[PDB]
Structure 1
Amino acid sequence: GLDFPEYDGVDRVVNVNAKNYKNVFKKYEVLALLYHEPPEDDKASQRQFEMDELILELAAQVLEDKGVGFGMVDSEKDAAVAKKLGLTEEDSVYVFKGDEVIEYDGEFSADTLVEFLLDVLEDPVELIEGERELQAFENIEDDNKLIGYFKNKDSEHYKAYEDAAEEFHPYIPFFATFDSKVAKKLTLKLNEIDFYEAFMEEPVTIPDKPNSEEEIVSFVEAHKRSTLRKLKPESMYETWEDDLDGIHIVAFAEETDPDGYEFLETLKAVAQDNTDNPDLSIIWIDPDDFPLLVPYWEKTFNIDLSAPQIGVVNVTDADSVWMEMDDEEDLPSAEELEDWLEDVLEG
């Protein structure tokens, strides 16, 4: 009987150098490049470099038929290539698509890279025509999202919207409709764009329509840090490095768990009630999304991640404090959570 696919060991990751880098770009619709330092001589450093290269090789096999290419650039041997491509972040992945470059800041794993690059392949704007499509849009909550109403694909204002969408692709989905019925239900005027903050129910309309590309981009940059934001593998390092005053409020909640779900609903209520507070950005971590970090978290924070948790983490030393909750009692209310956070953050 034929067996499942397996890693075949055939090398597909290109050693990108001065002589071939121009041809590599022409070959691939989407190109992922690991800009890396030369591996040190010690055995441990060699293993680390070995691990990353094989993760890329596995991703390259999976996406070979999709036209996604993978390459490596040595900061020393290929220093000239790095300069003309803008590769500055040491030991980091850069993703190239047409005229856009993405400095990847997420989990370095085959699963997350493949899912991410598959999303990169998609067009930057999703059209809403059917009712299923509209329902799918309305059910998104863990991403910021935008929806605009335009006359048709040839509208000057749609093209500006599409150009702005490319700047945040694929992290922030941009949706569009040309159908006056859909716009009516969304309460969109022609050329109007609504921004739906993650986990918020009410949108914010971009002012001064019709909107240029620059007006859209600047608005999204100002609103992309949501009051409640989910730690996602594709962007985990960016989220964590985006601390306010050197601390994060961190909430663990397993969405599929009855207690985790209830706690998440309370977190959303807290976020909703403080949405315009710029000094607040709670990170929600679903431990099911990070199975390899659960032991580390339980040891480091001395908590049981089979139950909801909320705490404050100092990003310098990983020192933390976590709210006590009794399993035999009902979970804390939104008022109780805000009260506890005020106590901790005062001192």
Structure 2
Amino acid sequence: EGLDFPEYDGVDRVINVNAKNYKNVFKKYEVLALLYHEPPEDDKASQRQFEMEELILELAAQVLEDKGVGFGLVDSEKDAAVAKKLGLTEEDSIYVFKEDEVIEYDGEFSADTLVEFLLDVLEDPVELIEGERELQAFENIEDEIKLIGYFKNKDSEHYKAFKEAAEEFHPYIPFFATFDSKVAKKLTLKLNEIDFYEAFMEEPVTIPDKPNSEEEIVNFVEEHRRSTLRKLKPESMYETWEDDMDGIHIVAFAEEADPDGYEFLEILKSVAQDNTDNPDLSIIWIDPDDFPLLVPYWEKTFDIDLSAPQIGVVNVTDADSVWMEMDDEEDLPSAEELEDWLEDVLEGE
């Protein structure tokens, strides 16, 4: 007869954002998530799809109520003028506002993913490294791009530029700073130097021409936005998938928590490292564990067993694909064999 776990309470919290209330809504919340959607269609199916999306927002709204995150709906017809002023263009899409930044969310429309994302948005844009714990944590990041700069202190003109740049990419690309010469030494940073670490790469590339303006940093990050090996992540999956390489993606499935999946991931990292300067190569790593609801679809569509590592090439137009044969009674292919296979497949078609 104990206390129940928290449950969705069925109380409506998602705001109908309109001409009359939108200014007040913005004032009330530090972070605001707005779904820009189309007016109700006549067909039951469309209505049910919208009903689901709105309830997903309700769940997130309940979870994040105490943290001052607000959720709202902007109707492209009824609220056309609000959309105009706020720059809402993308049909049935989520926009996130924090102070003077808009984020055009391009990730999974699930309560889990949205809540984690908005919790990340709430955080300060630069992570400072002081302790050994924090430095170690920084060093252990590999599945995303990361930047680290060394500056005199928070009042350095060059640190402020770095923070402005950080805000432009927040919370997708973590920006770290240190003001401690001992930390800078371990990181091999000179004062005002910023090191850019491509995902899954051991060695950073230093942003040239320090000290760097906000624009120099932003330009550099944009030019280096696509890592040679990048992970499909729920928070960013649509942006990653839509960034195809001339109509195809090389896709690798590997369950990191599995011995074979782990070994395969290490091989993919070697392939990446050996081809890092090749701008025509990007491989998407998908860990099936991250996307339980898509595994049946992938297994059916690609005709593969996702309990084993896989690598293939996928046509983004129609999901046509080809997958490398690997005998699970022998060792996984070496990096050289993977590259050879990719060459064979990509030269022919």
| TM-score, normalised via structure 1 length | 1.00
Give me the whole-angstrom Cα distance separating, in 2, the residues matched to 1:328 and 1:191.
Answer: 52
2:334 corresponding residue in structure 1: 333
1:72 corresponding residue in structure 2: 73
2:206 corresponding residue in structure 1: 205
Give me the whole-angstrom Cα distance separating, in 2, the residues matched to 1:73 and 1:14.
Answer: 9
Give me the whole-angstrom Cα distance separating, in 2, the residues matched to 1:333 and 1:139.
Answer: 25
Report how far residue 182 of structure 1 moved.
Answer: 0.2
C-alpha offsets along residues 36-61 of structure 1, whole Å, 9 cap, x if unaligned?
00121111111100000000000000
2:257 corresponding residue in structure 1: 256
Give me the whole-angstrom Cα distance separating, in 2, the residues matched to 1:91 and 1:135.
Answer: 40
Report how far residue 224 of structure 1 moved.
Answer: 1.5
Structure 2 counterpart SS, 1:330: coil
C-alpha offsets along residues 69-126 of structure 1, whole Å, 9 cap, x if unaligned?
0000000000000000000001000000000000000000000000000000000000
Report how far residue 3 of structure 1 moved.
Answer: 1.1
Give me the whole-angstrom Cα distance separating, in 1, the residues matched to 2:76 and 2:20.
Answer: 15
Residue 281 of structure 2 corresponds to residue 315 of structure 1? no
2:17 corresponding residue in structure 1: 16
Give me the whole-angstrom Cα distance separating, in 2, the residues matched to 1:99 and 1:262.
Answer: 44
Report how far residue 284 of structure 1 moved.
Answer: 0.1
Gaps of 5+ in 1: none
C-alpha offsets along residues 174-221 of structure 1, whole Å, 9 cap, x if unaligned?
000000000001010000000000000000000000000000000000
C-alpha offsets along residues 227-257 of structure 1, whole Å, 9 cap, x if unaligned?
0000000000000000011000000000000
Give me the whole-angstrom Cα distance separating, in 2, the residues matched to 1:41 and 1:257.
Answer: 47
Give me the whole-angstrom Cα distance separating, in 1, the residues matched to 2:339 and 2:245.
Answer: 17
Give me the whole-angstrom Cα distance separating, in 2, the residues matched to 1:39 and 1:137.
Answer: 47
Structure 2 counterpart SS, 1:236: helix
Give me the whole-angstrom Cα distance separating, in 2, the residues matched to 1:71 and 1:206.
Answer: 39
Give me the whole-angstrom Cα distance separating, in 2, the residues matched to 1:122 and 1:345.
Answer: 42
C-alpha offsets along residues 248-271 of structure 1, whole Å, 9 cap, x if unaligned?
000000000000000000000000
Structure 2 counterpart SS, 1:101: strand
C-alpha offsets along residues 266-287 of structure 1, whole Å, 9 cap, x if unaligned?
0000000000000000000000
Give me the whole-angstrom Cα distance separating, in 2, the residues matched to 1:259 and 1:39.
Answer: 48
Give me the whole-angstrom Cα distance separating, in 1, the residues matched to 2:252 and 2:292.
Answer: 16
What is the root-mean-square deviation in Å for CA atoms of aligned residues?
0.3
1:152 corresponding residue in structure 2: 153
Report how far residue 127 of structure 1 moved.
Answer: 0.2
Give me the whole-angstrom Cα distance separating, in 1, the residues matched to 2:318 and 2:282.
Answer: 20
Give me the whole-angstrom Cα distance separating, in 2, the residues matched to 1:22 and 1:158.
Answer: 32
Give me the whole-angstrom Cα distance separating, in 1, the residues matched to 2:16 and 2:94.
Answer: 14
Give me the whole-angstrom Cα distance separating, in 2, the residues matched to 1:44 and 1:187.
Answer: 57
C-alpha offsets along residues 274-315 of structure 1, whole Å, 9 cap, x if unaligned?
000000000000000000000000000000000000000010
C-alpha offsets along residues 152-185 of structure 1, whole Å, 9 cap, x if unaligned?
0000000000000000000000000000000001
Greater Cα offset, 35-44 or 177-186: 35-44
Report how far residue 67 of structure 1 moved.
Answer: 0.3
Structure 2 counterpart SS, 1:71: strand
Structure 1 counterpart SS, 2:53: helix
Greater Cα offset, 95-104 or 39-48: 39-48
Equivalenced residue count is 347
1:216 corresponding residue in structure 2: 217
1:122 corresponding residue in structure 2: 123
Give me the whole-angstrom Cα distance separating, in 2, the residues matched to 1:39 and 1:330.
Answer: 55
Give me the whole-angstrom Cα distance separating, in 2, the residues matched to 1:4 and 1:276.
Answer: 51
Gaps of 5+ in 2: none
Structure 2 counterpart SS, 1:142: coil
C-alpha offsets along residues 12-49 of structure 1, whole Å, 9 cap, x if unaligned?
00000000000000000000000000121111111100
Give me the whole-angstrom Cα distance separating, in 1, the residues matched to 2:182 and 2:97.
Answer: 37
Give me the whole-angstrom Cα distance separating, in 2, the residues matched to 1:37 and 1:85.
Answer: 16
Give me the whole-angstrom Cα distance separating, in 2, the residues matched to 1:83 and 1:4.
Answer: 42
Give me the whole-angstrom Cα distance separating, in 1, the residues matched to 2:83 and 2:204.
Answer: 41
Structure 1 counterpart SS, 2:185: helix
Residue 6 of structure 2 corresponds to residue 31 of structure 1? no
Give me the whole-angstrom Cα distance separating, in 1, the residues matched to 2:301 and 2:224.
Answer: 32
Give me the whole-angstrom Cα distance separating, in 1, the residues matched to 2:295 and 2:267.
Answer: 23
Residue 177 of structure 2 corresponds to residue 179 of structure 1? no
Tell me which stretches of 4 or more aligned residues in structure 1 moved more than 4 Å: none
Give me the whole-angstrom Cα distance separating, in 2, the residues matched to 1:149 and 1:305.
Answer: 43
Structure 2 counterpart SS, 1:64: coil
Give me the whole-angstrom Cα distance separating, in 2, the residues matched to 1:80 and 1:3.
Answer: 44
Give me the whole-angstrom Cα distance separating, in 1, the residues matched to 2:90 and 2:20.
Answer: 23
Report how far residue 63 of structure 1 moved.
Answer: 0.2
1:106 corresponding residue in structure 2: 107
